[PDB]
Design a protein around this motif. Structure first.
Motif, PDB file in Angstrom:
ATOM      1  N   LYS C   8       0.819  -1.206   0.000  1.00  0.00           N
ATOM      2  CA  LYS C   8       0.000   0.000   0.000  1.00  0.00           C
ATOM      3  C   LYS C   8       0.856   1.260   0.000  1.00  0.00           C
ATOM      4  CE  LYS C   8      -4.117   1.973   2.084  1.00  0.00           C
ATOM      5  NZ  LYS C   8      -4.520   2.648   3.347  1.00  0.00           N
ATOM      6  N   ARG C   9       2.049   1.201   0.595  1.00  0.00           N
ATOM      7  CA  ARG C   9       2.916   2.373   0.643  1.00  0.00           C
ATOM      8  C   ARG C   9       3.598   2.627  -0.697  1.00  0.00           C
ATOM      9  NH1 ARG C   9       5.583  -0.495   5.015  1.00  0.00           N
ATOM     10  NH2 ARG C   9       4.218  -0.539   6.845  1.00  0.00           N
ATOM     11  N   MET C  10       3.984   1.565  -1.408  1.00  0.00           N
ATOM     12  CA  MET C  10       4.631   1.745  -2.702  1.00  0.00           C
ATOM     13  C   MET C  10       3.645   2.213  -3.763  1.00  0.00           C
ATOM     14  SD  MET C  10       7.922   1.332  -3.289  1.00  0.00           S
ATOM     15  CE  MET C  10       9.318   1.009  -2.217  1.00  0.00           C
ATOM     16  N   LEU C  11       2.370   1.849  -3.629  1.00  0.00           N
ATOM     17  CA  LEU C  11       1.336   2.208  -4.589  1.00  0.00           C
ATOM     18  C   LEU C  11       0.537   3.432  -4.157  1.00  0.00           C
ATOM     19  CD1 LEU C  11      -0.009  -1.400  -5.251  1.00  0.00           C
ATOM     20  CD2 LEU C  11       1.872  -0.228  -6.402  1.00  0.00           C
ATOM     21  N   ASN C  12       1.097   4.269  -3.291  1.00  0.00           N
ATOM     22  CA  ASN C  12       0.365   5.411  -2.764  1.00  0.00           C
ATOM     23  C   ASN C  12       0.312   6.542  -3.781  1.00  0.00           C
ATOM     24  OD1 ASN C  12      -0.927   7.075  -0.704  1.00  0.00           O
ATOM     25  ND2 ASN C  12       1.034   8.157  -0.583  1.00  0.00           N
ATOM     26  N   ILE C  13      -0.816   7.251  -3.799  1.00  0.00           N
ATOM     27  CA  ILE C  13      -0.986   8.450  -4.604  1.00  0.00           C
ATOM     28  C   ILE C  13      -1.564   9.526  -3.692  1.00  0.00           C
ATOM     29  CG2 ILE C  13      -2.219   9.537  -6.516  1.00  0.00           C
ATOM     30  CD1 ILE C  13      -2.174   6.700  -7.846  1.00  0.00           C
TER      31      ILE C  13
ATOM     32  N   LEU D  77     -12.732   2.125 -25.770  1.00  0.00           N
ATOM     33  CA  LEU D  77     -12.356   2.629 -24.457  1.00  0.00           C
ATOM     34  C   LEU D  77     -13.052   1.811 -23.376  1.00  0.00           C
ATOM     35  CD1 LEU D  77     -12.966   6.399 -25.303  1.00  0.00           C
ATOM     36  CD2 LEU D  77     -10.856   5.121 -25.661  1.00  0.00           C
ATOM     37  N   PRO D  78     -12.434   0.744 -22.878  1.00  0.00           N
ATOM     38  CA  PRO D  78     -13.069  -0.049 -21.824  1.00  0.00           C
ATOM     39  C   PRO D  78     -13.014   0.645 -20.471  1.00  0.00           C
ATOM     40  CG  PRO D  78     -10.915  -0.937 -22.305  1.00  0.00           C
ATOM     41  CD  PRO D  78     -11.147   0.163 -23.298  1.00  0.00           C
ATOM     42  N   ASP D  79     -13.957   0.258 -19.613  1.00  0.00           N
ATOM     43  CA  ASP D  79     -14.064   0.801 -18.259  1.00  0.00           C
ATOM     44  C   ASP D  79     -13.318  -0.130 -17.310  1.00  0.00           C
ATOM     45  OD1 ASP D  79     -15.505   3.275 -17.351  1.00  0.00           O
ATOM     46  OD2 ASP D  79     -16.951   2.577 -18.846  1.00  0.00           O
ATOM     47  N   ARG D  80     -11.995  -0.011 -17.315  1.00  0.00           N
ATOM     48  CA  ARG D  80     -11.193  -0.860 -16.452  1.00  0.00           C
ATOM     49  C   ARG D  80     -11.351  -0.417 -14.998  1.00  0.00           C
ATOM     50  NH1 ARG D  80      -5.269  -1.730 -18.093  1.00  0.00           N
ATOM     51  NH2 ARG D  80      -5.126   0.283 -19.176  1.00  0.00           N
ATOM     52  N   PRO D  81     -11.360  -1.352 -14.051  1.00  0.00           N
ATOM     53  CA  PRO D  81     -11.438  -0.969 -12.637  1.00  0.00           C
ATOM     54  C   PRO D  81     -10.138  -0.407 -12.086  1.00  0.00           C
ATOM     55  CG  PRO D  81     -11.298  -3.337 -12.865  1.00  0.00           C
ATOM     56  CD  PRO D  81     -11.586  -2.796 -14.223  1.00  0.00           C
ATOM     57  N   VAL D  82     -10.287   0.517 -11.140  1.00  0.00           N
ATOM     58  CA  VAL D  82      -9.181   1.010 -10.328  1.00  0.00           C
ATOM     59  C   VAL D  82      -9.268   0.251  -9.013  1.00  0.00           C
ATOM     60  CG1 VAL D  82      -8.049   3.021  -9.334  1.00  0.00           C
ATOM     61  CG2 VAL D  82      -9.372   3.254 -11.441  1.00  0.00           C
ATOM     62  N   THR D  83      -8.213  -0.489  -8.684  1.00  0.00           N
ATOM     63  CA  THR D  83      -8.249  -1.456  -7.598  1.00  0.00           C
ATOM     64  C   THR D  83      -7.614  -0.965  -6.305  1.00  0.00           C
ATOM     65  OG1 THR D  83      -6.497  -2.450  -8.942  1.00  0.00           O
ATOM     66  CG2 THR D  83      -8.579  -3.633  -8.759  1.00  0.00           C
ATOM     67  N   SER D  84      -7.323   0.324  -6.182  1.00  0.00           N
ATOM     68  CA  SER D  84      -6.789   0.875  -4.945  1.00  0.00           C
ATOM     69  C   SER D  84      -7.821   1.802  -4.321  1.00  0.00           C
ATOM     70  CB  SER D  84      -5.482   1.626  -5.200  1.00  0.00           C
ATOM     71  OG  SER D  84      -4.510   1.295  -4.224  1.00  0.00           O
ATOM     72  N   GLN D  85      -8.131   1.563  -3.050  1.00  0.00           N
ATOM     73  CA  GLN D  85      -9.059   2.386  -2.290  1.00  0.00           C
ATOM     74  C   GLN D  85      -8.297   3.212  -1.265  1.00  0.00           C
ATOM     75  OE1 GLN D  85     -12.520   1.487   0.807  1.00  0.00           O
ATOM     76  NE2 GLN D  85     -13.030   0.728  -1.239  1.00  0.00           N
ATOM     77  N   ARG D  86      -8.545   4.516  -1.267  1.00  0.00           N
ATOM     78  CA  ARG D  86      -7.905   5.450  -0.356  1.00  0.00           C
ATOM     79  C   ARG D  86      -8.969   6.383   0.198  1.00  0.00           C
ATOM     80  NH1 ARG D  86      -5.039   6.016  -4.894  1.00  0.00           N
ATOM     81  NH2 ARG D  86      -3.354   4.500  -5.220  1.00  0.00           N
ATOM     82  N   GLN D  87      -8.771   6.836   1.431  1.00  0.00           N
ATOM     83  CA  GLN D  87      -9.811   7.602   2.116  1.00  0.00           C
ATOM     84  C   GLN D  87      -9.653   9.097   1.868  1.00  0.00           C
ATOM     85  OE1 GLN D  87     -11.939   5.641   2.858  1.00  0.00           O
ATOM     86  NE2 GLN D  87     -10.751   3.751   3.051  1.00  0.00           N
ATOM     87  N   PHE D  88      -9.547   9.447   0.591  1.00  0.00           N
ATOM     88  CA  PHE D  88      -9.410  10.823   0.136  1.00  0.00           C
ATOM     89  C   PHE D  88      -9.638  10.810  -1.368  1.00  0.00           C
ATOM     90  CE2 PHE D  88      -5.114   9.144   1.093  1.00  0.00           C
ATOM     91  CZ  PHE D  88      -4.683   8.905  -0.190  1.00  0.00           C
ATOM     92  N   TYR D  89      -9.835  11.993  -1.936  1.00  0.00           N
ATOM     93  CA  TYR D  89      -9.934  12.140  -3.380  1.00  0.00           C
ATOM     94  C   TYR D  89      -8.598  12.618  -3.929  1.00  0.00           C
ATOM     95  CZ  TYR D  89     -14.877  11.425  -4.538  1.00  0.00           C
ATOM     96  OH  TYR D  89     -16.115  10.881  -4.784  1.00  0.00           O
ATOM     97  N   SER D  90      -8.161  11.996  -5.022  1.00  0.00           N
ATOM     98  CA  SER D  90      -6.920  12.369  -5.683  1.00  0.00           C
ATOM     99  C   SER D  90      -7.127  13.328  -6.846  1.00  0.00           C
ATOM    100  CB  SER D  90      -6.192  11.115  -6.173  1.00  0.00           C
ATOM    101  OG  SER D  90      -5.286  10.638  -5.195  1.00  0.00           O
ATOM    102  N   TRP D  91      -8.370  13.638  -7.199  1.00  0.00           N
ATOM    103  CA  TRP D  91      -8.641  14.611  -8.252  1.00  0.00           C
ATOM    104  C   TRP D  91      -9.606  15.674  -7.747  1.00  0.00           C
ATOM    105  CZ3 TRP D  91      -9.064   9.336  -8.767  1.00  0.00           C
ATOM    106  CH2 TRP D  91     -10.332   8.780  -8.576  1.00  0.00           C
TER     107      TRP D  91
END
Ligand code: K
Ligand code: K
Ligand code: MG
Ligand code: MG
Ligand code: MG
Ligand code: MG
Ligand code: MG
Ligand code: MG
Ligand code: MG
Ligand code: MG
Ligand code: MG
Ligand code: MG
Ligand code: MG
Ligand code: MG
Ligand code: MG
Ligand code: MG
Ligand code: MG
Ligand code: MG
Ligand code: MG
Ligand code: MG
Ligand code: MG
Ligand code: MG
Ligand code: ZN
Lengths: 307, 57, 161, 91, 192, 89
Positions: C8-13, D77-91
């Motif tokens: 999770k740390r290496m793939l952080n954004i 243009l396929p709708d590929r999933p984003v598989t990382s969940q984070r408790q904030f918005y990056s955009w």
RNA sequence: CAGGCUAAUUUGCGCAAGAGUGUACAAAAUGAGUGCGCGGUUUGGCACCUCGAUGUCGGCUUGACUAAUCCUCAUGGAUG
RNA sequence: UCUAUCUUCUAGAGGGAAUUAGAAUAUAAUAAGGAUUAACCUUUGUACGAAAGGAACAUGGGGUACUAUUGUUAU
RNA sequence: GUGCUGAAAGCAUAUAGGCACGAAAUUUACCUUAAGAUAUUUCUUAAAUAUACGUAAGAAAAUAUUACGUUAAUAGGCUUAGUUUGUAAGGAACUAAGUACUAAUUUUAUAAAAAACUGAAUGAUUAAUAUAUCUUACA
């Protein structure tokens, strides 16, 4: 990389976008730079396909015995010219002999159909220096294409020798015969060093294998005789291959081209022996469209049974 | 051998390009119609004609 | 990596720059237009009823046009009398007076010639067969790419593309 | 992948086939140098054939064709999933 | 490394290979036909066609060279310079016919052939061509161009010619030799 | 101008129909010889070996070696006394 | 025994300095006893390490690489 | 003493994915390797040198075939 | 290693800047294998083509490579001319040329599934539609 210093994908075509007219340096590689560093060596005129017929001596008046090989020209025609704007280099395609229509495929039957030439036995390209070396398609080249005393190069496939050893293939000395040797007379001996040399056999190591049956060029062979009726061009020395094999004969690259008068006389003899080489070619091209269009529609049967 | 050859590298050596080739050069026999090899004589008609020429002659 | 925590740390954004300007004192409402596609539930002000009371100024005001692609023009060059000639010719010689011949003659769009007149059934069935005989000369590789073009168009209209 | 044209759906064919190993036919002795002997097992083997009619191949082909028309078409243009969940918005 | 082979060695010694060829040529004359392997039938074919060429010479040297190939000359020379000499008097070469056949020995599955003397009492192509003609007449079919081409080959130089060929056909039909023959019109409907 | 040609036909064995045919060109049946060339060049370094041109597009002798040995013997022995002094007579 | 560490020693070298030789004149050539070094060829030290050895090496076959060059190629200095 | 399992190597093949429907024939950029020696005569015996001695540079030495070159006799 | 111009540094300097000569080494050239873009007014709608089989070979451990298969000189035989042996006899492994004498030879053998996406340029053919209602016409 895969070949050389280039990491460019093989499917990408960027050549037309890097032009010297835009102020870029003329590249050191490419078809343009390859022809510029071969301008002097490249032969001015095309070659001929000949068939090795045997070896003999040319006995000359006053006492000269000159070993020579006989090469015969068997209906040598001009089939196609390879220009630089279409192929990337100058060359002339020459044909030799004939082949039965049944054995020639449809892809090739329609190829000769668009030229007016009977199907040939073999085809070969001869690189010429510039556009002055391209000849009309459908003209026959006779032994007089060369002159006595003209040095040429003969390219032919050497005799096959199958799986050769180390002695015959690479000239290895072998080992002893009776002073205690043990089952190792014609073997190659050592194949490398030990751990300090890579613990492997080094690429390029000479070993037994197949020998022969490859192209070999003999340079600087004078022309002792030129007989049109026989169709032969007698050259000095030996030539690679067996009797009855086709060889390629052309001017020597390491020798100056023949005089300007000769290169023009030979070109002037094709306009006399074949006064209409373009009218017979345009007529064949005009017919190919009719037959190619009848094949497409499916009415080819009508034309065959027209007369 | 230094090691034992695995099931994969031994199956490559045994079946990769070593599949038995189906004989496709078969034609029928004019006298009897039975299947025979091409350019070859029928084995059932050879024996029968070969024996037919031994009885009467 | 070795553990899921190390992955999770290496793939952080990191989050967006806007969220990182946390207020030291008090709460503030900030404008953070996202760089994304708006949904269809953000009704434009032009589609809101005059009755609706939520038509505010742009949120920018609370703190040329792009290149043309399709600007058609409708034209009516066929008079009522000319609509009867189209129906006579089409029914007389449907092979000579096609919708392209009639479209060019009366300066009309090919679709319109079909709106006012229809070829006889025999001619219509002849057209579907020609295209049906054309759909049998397609190999398995071309017939599969021609079917995908017909499914991608129906999916597009189902909101699936 | 071989293309066939079935005019008689009752034609018998060899659906499956596998070879098994049976008992030991016999035992030969291999007399080498230095008075050494080795046992050589003579093998016997069997084969199994599973015979089926051409109706099995016409059914299995319709299944593969239906599974190929069920995976949907290829979209640009396929709708590929984003598989990382984070408790904030990056955009 | 050296030269190519001039002929087949057949995995034999020099003397063993000269006796193998003299025995096949001896059985060929005595029996008019032999069923051996294909490489053996093709090596004796060159020695049997050169022995019949000596039988067509009037010199004594040919009569002494024919005695040096056969293994029972006293019993086989009269046949060589007799019946055989008269048979092949008008033929310009090509006195033998090698026909490929299914393996004579099934153990080794070695390709076999039949070496025979053309226009002989045991010519297998004269009988196979007679069986084809017999079936065609007995089934109201039309002979193929290859059957017509073989019918003339086996009757051009033969003494009786067509008459001897029509007798063979008559003897194969009165015996019902073509009984159970698959008609050529039903070969496209047969799988097994 | 259109040279002579013959048609080669590729037919089907299943339907007995013409799959595709081509116009195969053949060299002139009656070989046409041409008058002597008027191209005469004077240069010391070379000579054009156009003495006797054969008919156009015709196969030359398959075995020119025995024909070539009789050209050098006739040139090295214009009389024949040398060739006859070692003949089998 | 080979590999590994070390470099006392060496039939391995370089550089700095210059007593001296060079009729004259240090550095054309030559270079005492020394200093600062590179390198891993000889004879050694050590002992991480049991293995093809006490002449550790010779001949044969077949190499690959190094450059401190015997030959071939370009070239500076040389009251000497 | 050792019938080579693996890597490396020398050869030759089966299949393959190609701007991509697949072929026949001739093929370029480019890549990887191969070939790779030395001597002798020829300077106006010249430059240099009192003499004895004696260079550098350059051209040629493929032809009792062509051609080039040098001589020899005949016109 | 040897120069021209020429300053920093009034001089000097082939030092920076602007030009140049210069080696059996390097690069090219030469030769071979590999590579396989490209070319042809080339072929193919279930084929083009390739394979198998048969006669072979300029090929050869297998494989592969290059020809030929009757409208055919691929191999063998035969014939003539060479060559060789030898008495200018009689033969002959061999070479060349000629000759369809023998074999390439049984009635639709096998493999080969075969034209993507977007933009631009430019043709052909066609309802390439929707809403209201349950009847409408005929007999
Ligand atoms: K020995
Ligand atoms: K310098
Ligand atoms: Mg060979
Ligand atoms: Mg020796
Ligand atoms: Mg390593
Ligand atoms: Mg290793
Ligand atoms: Mg014992
Ligand atoms: Mg054996
Ligand atoms: Mg003996
Ligand atoms: Mg002093
Ligand atoms: Mg030196
Ligand atoms: Mg000096
Ligand atoms: Mg192995
Ligand atoms: Mg190239
Ligand atoms: Mg040299
Ligand atoms: Mg001379
Ligand atoms: Mg200055
Ligand atoms: Mg200066
Ligand atoms: Mg095309
Ligand atoms: Mg086909
Ligand atoms: Mg072989
Ligand atoms: Mg022959
Ligand atoms: Zn039969």
């Amino acid at each position: 990389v895969k070949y050389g210093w280039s990491t460019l994908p093989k499917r990408s075509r960027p050549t037309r976008f890097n032009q010297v007219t835009q102020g870029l340096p003329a590249p050191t590689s490419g078809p343009a730079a390859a022809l510029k560093r071969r301008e002097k060596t490249t032969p001015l005129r095309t070659g001929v396909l000949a068939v090795k017929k045997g070896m003999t001596v040319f006995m000359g008046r006053t006492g000269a015995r000159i070993p020579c090989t006989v090469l015969q020209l068997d209906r040598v025609q001009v089939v196609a010219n390879k220009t630089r704007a279409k192929n990337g280099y100058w060359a002339v395609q020459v044909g030799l002999g004939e082949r039965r229509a049944e054995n020639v495929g449809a892809p090739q039957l329609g190829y000769y159909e668009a030229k007016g030439i009977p199907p040939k036995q073999t085809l070969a390209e001869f690189k010429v220096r510039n556009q002055d070396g391209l000849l009309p398609v459908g003209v026959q080249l006779f032994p007089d294409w060369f002159h006595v005393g003209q040095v040429v190069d003969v390219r032919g496939i050497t005799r096959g020798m199958g799986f050769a050893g180390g002695m015959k293939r690479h000239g290895f000395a072998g080992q002893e015969a009776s002073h205690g040797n043990s089952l190792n007379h014609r073997t190659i001996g050592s194949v490398g060093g030990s751990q300090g040399s890579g613990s492997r056999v080094l690429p390029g190591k000479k070993m037994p294998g197949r020998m022969g049956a490859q192209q070999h060029t003999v340079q600087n062979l004078p022309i002792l005789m030129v007989d049109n009726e026989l169709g032969i061009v007698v050259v000095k020395g030996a030539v690679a291959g067996h009797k009855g094999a086709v060889v390629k004969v052309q001017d020597a690259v390491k020798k100056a081209p023949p005089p300007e008068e000769f290169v023009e006389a030979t070109k002037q003899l094709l306009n006399e022996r074949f006064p209409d080489a373009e009218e017979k070619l345009q007529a064949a091209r005009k017919l190919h469209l009719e037959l190619k269009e009848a094949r497409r529609q499916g009415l080819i049967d009508s034309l065959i049974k027209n007369g | 051998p230094k090691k034992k050859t695995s099931h994969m590298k031994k199956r490559h050596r045994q079946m990769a390009g070593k599949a038995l080739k189906d004989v496709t050069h078969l034609n029928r026999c004019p006298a009897c119609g039975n299947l025979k090899r091409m350019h070859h004589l029928c084995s059932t008609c050879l024996g029968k004609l070969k024996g037919f020429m031994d009885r009467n002659g | 990596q070795s553990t899921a925590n190390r992955t999770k740390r290496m793939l952080n954004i990191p989050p967006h720059e806007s969220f990182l300007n946390v207020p030291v004192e008090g709460d503030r409402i900030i404008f953070n237009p996202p760089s994304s596609e708006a949904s269809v539930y953000h009704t434009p002000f032009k589609f809101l009823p005059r009755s609706d009371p939520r038509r505010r100024a742009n949120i920018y005001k609370l703190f040329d046009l792009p290149p043309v692609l399709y600007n058609p023009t409708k034209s009516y060059n066929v008079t009522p009398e000319q609509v009867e000639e189209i129906r006579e010719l089409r029914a007389k010689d449907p092979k000579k007076y096609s919708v392209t011949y009639l479209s060019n003659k009366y300066n009309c769009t090919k679709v319109f010639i079909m709106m006012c007149t229809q070829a006889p059934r025999e001619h219509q069935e002849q057209h579907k067969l020609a295209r049906a005989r054309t759909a049998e000369n397609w190999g398995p590789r071309r017939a599969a790419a021609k079917l995908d073009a017909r499914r991608r168009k129906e999916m597009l209209h189902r909101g699936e593309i | 992948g071989k293309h066939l044209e079935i005019r008689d759906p009752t034609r018998i064919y060899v659906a499956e086939t596998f070879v098994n190993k049976g008992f030991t036919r016999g035992v030969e002795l291999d007399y080498r140098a230095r008075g050494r002997v080795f046992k050589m097992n003579k093998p016997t083997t069997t084969m199994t054939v599973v015979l089926k009619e051409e109706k099995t191949r016409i059914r299995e082909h319709q299944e593969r064709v239906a599974k190929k028309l069920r995976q949907g078409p290829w979209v640009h243009l396929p709708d590929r999933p984003v598989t990382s969940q984070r408790q904030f918005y990056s955009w | 490394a050296g030269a190519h082979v001039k002929y087949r060695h057949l995995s034999r010694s020099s003397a063993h290979r000269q006796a193998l060829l003299r025995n096949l040529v001896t059985s060929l004359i005595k029996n008019e036909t032999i069923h051996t392997t294909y490489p053996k039938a093709k090596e004796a074919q060159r020695l049997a066609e050169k022995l019949i060429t000596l039988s067509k010479r009037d010199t004594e040297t040919a009569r002494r060279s024919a005695q040096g190939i056969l293994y029972t000359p006293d019993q086989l020379l009269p046949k060589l310079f007799g019946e055989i000499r008269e048979r092949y008097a008008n033929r310009p070469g090509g006195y033998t016919r090698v026909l490929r056949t299914e393996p004579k020995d099934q153990y080794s599955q070695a390709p076999s052939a039949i070496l025979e003397l053309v226009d002989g009492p045991k010519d297998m192509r004269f009988a196979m061509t007679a069986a084809t003609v017999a079936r065609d007449r007995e089934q109201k079919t039309e002979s193929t161009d290859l059957t017509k081409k073989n019918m003339d080959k086996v009757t051009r130089f033969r003494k009786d010619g067509m008459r001897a060929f029509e007798d063979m056909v008559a003897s194969l039909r009165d015996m019902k030799f073509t009984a159970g023959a698959i008609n050529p019109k039903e070969w496209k409907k047969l799988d097994r | 101008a259109l040279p002579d040609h013959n048609f080669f036909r590729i037919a089907d064995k299943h339907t007995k129909k013409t799959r595709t045919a081509f116009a195969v060109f053949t060299p002139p049946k009656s070989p046409t010889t041409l008058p002597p060339s008027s191209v005469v060049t004077k240069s010391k370094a070379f000579k054009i070996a156009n003495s006797k041109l054969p008919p156009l597009m015709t196969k030359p002798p398959s075995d020119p070696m025995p024909l070539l040995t009789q050209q050098q013997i006739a040139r090295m022995d214009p009389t024949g006394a040398r060739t006859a002094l070692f003949s089998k007579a």
